[PDB]
Symmetry: D2
Subunit: 79 residues, 4 copies
């Protein structure tokens, strides 16, 4: 079971994690606000999110996969 | 081709978003460090994560939902 | 690149996968219908889905995890 | 405690759902077997899955969206 010490520790784990989860939500909300402003100024949010997605990935692997993709699409007449 | 105005604003958007994402990554890292510390003290990280998930809903509705679960589980043997 | 043979193969992969994905959607829709009927007859859908969830998991691991869970919850006064 | 009526219907619901789930599992297995076969013939399963995902949307809007992407990617260098 959990003793006085372990009980105290457990409480701290939950409280610490919960505080951080709140901060994570604040950041997530701020990111949503940025996209909201961008949409208001005429930018395509979906495309913006893909730009951020692409920039996260390794360039070498991204360019290689995009190459194989174009091959398959044109093979079945899609690009 | 986007003009200088749209170009300059596009860069600021991506730069800003990417900044928040790193800030979010830091927070996610801190959450891992707590669970990693807990695991070191003999805690079950998987169970801990569920407790946090459980605590998102109030205790009343929690036990009410679980009462129906046991009612169903006992009914089907 | 893709030759005549590989091009023919690729087309078959996409068509075969796409047909199966359609069937997967039919099943998923049928599952939704069952829950719709259950809800109509007074059953809590959320609880039902958890019953199916529990029954999928290994009983030994499930019972062990549920045991550790009750320990932690009562330690911080939640159960 | 649920009565005989609610009990009997509860069992049928879970039994039915669980049956559909296995049927769904079979279909998911068949999809894996195709990709496993494709990989054997030298295809890239990850790319194949994207093609199926791409084909869900029509070619017109596809290339329209990608045109904006390149416009944005070139603007930010």
């Amino acid at each position: 079971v959990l003793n006085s010490t372990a009980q105290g520790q457990l409480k701290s784990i939950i409280e610490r994690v919960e505080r951080l989860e709140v901060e994570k939500a604040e950041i997530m909300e701020q990111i949503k606000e940025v996209y909201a402003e961008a949409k208001g100024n005429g930018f395509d949010v979906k495309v913006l999110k893909k730009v951020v997605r692409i920039r996260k990935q390794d360039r070498a692997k991204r360019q290689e996969e995009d190459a194989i993709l174009d091959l398959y699409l044109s093979a079945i007449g899609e690009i």
